[PDB]
Amino acid sequence: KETAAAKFERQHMDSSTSAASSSNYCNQMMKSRNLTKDRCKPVNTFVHESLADVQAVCSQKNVACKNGQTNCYQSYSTMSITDCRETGSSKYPNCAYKTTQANKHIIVACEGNPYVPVHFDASV
Numbered sequence: 001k002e003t004a005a006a007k008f009e010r011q012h013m014d015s016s017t018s019a020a021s022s023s024n025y026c027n028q029m030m031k032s033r034n035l036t037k038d039r040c041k042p043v044n045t046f047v048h049e050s051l052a053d054v055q056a057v058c059s060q061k062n063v064a065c066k067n068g069q070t071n072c073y074q075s076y077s078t079m080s081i082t083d084c085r086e087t088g089s090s091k092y093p094n095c096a097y098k099t100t101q102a103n104k105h106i107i108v109a110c111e112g113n114p115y116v117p118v119h120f121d122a123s124v
């Protein structure tokens with residue numbers, strides 16, 4: 001059904017907000033993007049840059065993926081992101097998260113034709 005590329009956009013792209021803002025951002029976004037459907041997804045990152053800029057990372061610095069694969073890339077420029085981390089008192093289906101804004105280089109895995117992001121590996 002949903003392609004890996006489309007899933008990446010649903011899970012990691014949010015260009016509408018320059019920095020997400022609002023302490024409720026993650027609680028609202030993790031739910032709206034259906035990341036709390038089956039379970040409370042532990043951690044998830046939203047990137048506040050244009051789709052084009054994020055897709056372009058696939059042609060940037062080639063770095064090893066955490067899983068050992070070689071199709072991961074690190075952005076040369078830092079990007080505005082928001083990490084969503086589940087709290088301790090968080091109990092499904094009422095998933096709770098802490099919203100933390102940051103400016104770091106992102107690392108994503110890319111594949112396909114067009115060669116686009118299909119997984120968010122890390123931020124550094």
Ligand SMILES: O=c1ccn([C@H]2C[C@H](OP(=O)(O)O)[C@@H](CO)O2)c(=O)[nH]1
Nearest residue numbers: 011043044045118119120121122123
């Ligand atoms: O800083 C991080 C680290 C991990 N994840 C993610 C990557 C995965 O989701 P994913 O392949 O769909 O993109 C999941 C399992 O690690 O959580 C983020 O969003 N940000």
